Structure 1
Amino acid sequence: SMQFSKMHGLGNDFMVVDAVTQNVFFSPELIRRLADAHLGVGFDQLLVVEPPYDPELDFHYRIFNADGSEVAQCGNGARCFARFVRLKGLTNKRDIRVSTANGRMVLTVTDDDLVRVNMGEPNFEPSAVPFRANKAEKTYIMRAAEQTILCGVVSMGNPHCVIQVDDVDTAAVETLGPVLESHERFPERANIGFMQVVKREHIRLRVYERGAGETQACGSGACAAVAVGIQQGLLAEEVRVELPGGRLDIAWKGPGHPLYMTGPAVHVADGFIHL
């Protein structure tokens, strides 16, 4: 009986498997069988915890989708991994060093059982977003269709354009999102975020992702909207962010420092399945 847990993070449902103390090989055929909600377990994504490849790291973990393919999205599933290895007694560390398909990270489990990720230092140089603009500013003007708007632009690995709305339920997400996502001044498109500032330390936000549109949880967008609000002088050094998928908490001391993202992971169930 192979044991597993179901967990939830970033509005995403994970099947999580300890393949450190269990001998399991995840062929694509087994993965698709496990993704079947009636023959197997059913999951959005499968998180497999493995022994490390490097003697200096604690674990390696992989993420597979329902088709049986390995998925390499940076930071994906990090919060549920860190809590899972602690919940299951695979480690007692609070700073867990782990390798993924996108490299290695150091994950910190805070004493409130939240997981903090170092997302690096945001980059506002329009050359590296990439953005058609002569030099970096705290705000840019862009004529979008029959409407002139203001925005900040930053890259966190991926391009981001953030604009301030005064409520996100009253936001023109479906009419405005696509127009600036594929705007001529974004040669590689960009994730557009609609940021309703409730307080210098509190924000609501919806995000029109680059290729997908509105996902209920996009971590890089929350990082971007807080990075710009700080650089624009509108926000405190530590901001709460509320998205349709849940709440994140960003922290960043400004240029020269790395930005930190902290989020929850919910342990919803444990289970058995005979393979």
Structure 2
Amino acid sequence: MQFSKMHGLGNDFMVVDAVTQNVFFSPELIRRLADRHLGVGFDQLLVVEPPYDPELDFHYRIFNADGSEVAQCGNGARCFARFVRLKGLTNKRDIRVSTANGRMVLTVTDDDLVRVNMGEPNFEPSAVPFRANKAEKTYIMRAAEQTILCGVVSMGNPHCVIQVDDVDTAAVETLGPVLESHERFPERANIGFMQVVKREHIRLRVYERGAGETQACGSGACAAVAVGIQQGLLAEEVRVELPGGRLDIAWKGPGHPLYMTGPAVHVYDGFIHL
């Protein structure tokens, strides 16, 4: 079986053409391939498939390192889109794709970046979920003796966003775990530490649900810009510098989808005889 190793800003995928190949997986096999010492090594497996609607171009499916399916908007979408082009499955720069829970158009730009429609930011606390009296632009959270000012939004997953003076000095490693499992987040939260540089540029670090801090959290970048915007801090096109590199977020406010443009890298091609 042929596969490709890819990553978006360090989020790494084993990518399999299940269009031109007959490929089978089990949860156990996926756990065995994800293992970084004993297998291929990856965070997620992306399986590229023929479409099941005559008007789309592909379907794709994602499994995590535990062998279970992940259904998260834009997850793996930039690696998917460059893959189908790099391997000759398509010529299009506008690629229509279905996923576990949706349907979306990916635009591959001339500089090899991919523009993803991330949907509309949802600020209502009950959708996050987030325990609160009602929606507010800013919230006070009590973290032991510390007082925290934050914004909260759902990108389909939950985010708590905290404006900081300097991401380098932010207490990601100490306050992230506190907030990540706070009682007011019944399903936990991704904790973003946003430093505003200009209205068009932020630096960001994210302590992610379950996983802590990594080089890059795409949905947390979207949540940070969405919060920064509706607190009047940011312009409608914002450059987001994460530890692992740069994303660009574009949102025109409530009533409009938010877009994320970022890179995807092909590392190597593999062959494994399952």
Q: What is the TM-score of this pair, normalised by structure 1?
A: 0.89
Relative to structure 1, the CA distance from residue 233 to residue 7 in structure 2 (aligned partners, 3 Å threshold; closer, same or farther) is same
Deviates more, 1:129-138 or 1:33-42: 33-42
Following TM superposition, by how much is the alpha carbon of 1:272 offset from its aligned partner in structure 2, in angstroms?
3.5
State how far apart, in whole Å, the 2-side matches of 1:103 and 1:58 are. 14
Gaps of 5+ in 1: none
Partners of 1:207 and 1:75 in 2: CA distance: 18
Give the stretch that moved more between structures: 126-135 or 224-233: 126-135
Bigger shift: residues 252-261 or 24-33: 24-33
**Cα distance change on mapping 1:167 and 1:258 into 2, 3 Å:** same
Question: Given the superposition, is the C-alpha separation of residues 181 and 45 from structure 1 closer, same or farther in structure 2, using an over 3 Å criterion?
Answer: closer
| CA distances 1:170-201 after superposition (whole Å, capped 9, x unpaired) | 01112211222233333333222110112211
Q: Distance in 1 between matches of 2:226 and 2:201?
A: 13
> Which residue does the alignment assign to 2:124?
125
**What's the offset of the Cα at 1:25?**
2.9
Contact 2:3–2:271 under 8 Å retained in 1: yes
In 2 relative to 1, CA 88–238 (structure 1 residues): closer, same or farther, beyond 3 Å? Answer: same
Q: In the TM superposition, what whole-angstrom CA distance separates every residue of 1:199-250 from its partner, at most 9, and x where no partner exists?
A: 2111111112233322332211111110011111111111111222322111
TM score, norm. by length of structure 2: 0.89
Equivalent residue for 2:31? 32
Summarize the Cα distance change of 1:197–1:21 in structure 2 as closer, same or farther, 3 Å threshold: same
- Which stretch shifts more, 136-145 or 260-269? 136-145
Spell out the pairing of 1:1-275 with structure 2 (5 A cutoff): 2-28=1-27, 31=30, 34-35=33-34, 41-66=40-65, 68-275=67-274
> Is the Cα contact below 8 Å between 2:200 and 2:235 reproduced in 1?
yes
Offset of residue 259 of structure 1 = 0.6
In 2: Cα distance, 1:184 partner to 1:197 partner = 28
Alpha-carbon deviation of 1:138? 2.0
Provide closer, same or farther for how the CA distance between residues 209 and 37 of structure 1 changes in structure 2, counting only shifts above 3 A. closer
Task: Spell out, residue by residue over 1:25-80, the C-alpha distance to the aligned partner (whole angstroms, 9 max, x if none).
Answer: 33456545655668764433332211112212111122234554444343221111
Q: Deviations over 1:98-129 (max 9, x none)?
A: 12223322211122211111111112222322
Q: For residue 257 of structure 1, report the CA deviation from its aligned partner.
A: 1.0
Q: Which has the larger radius of gyration?
A: 1
Runs of 5+ unmatched residues, structure 2: none
- Residue 22 (structure 1) shift: 2.3
Contact 2:73–2:118 (Cα < 8 Å) also in 1: no
**Distance in 2 between the 1:274 and 1:131 partners?**
47
Change (3 A) 1:240 1:56: same
> Residues 163 and 196 of structure 2 are in contact (CA less than 8 Å); yes or no, is this contact kept in structure 1?
yes
Q: Evaluate the alpha carbon distance shift between residue 114 and residue 30 of structure 1 in structure 2; reply closer, same or farther with a 3 A threshold.
A: same
- Once the two structures are overlaid, the 10-residue window that deviates more, 35-44 or 238-247, is 35-44
Q: 1:163 to 1:35 in 2, by over 3 A?
A: closer
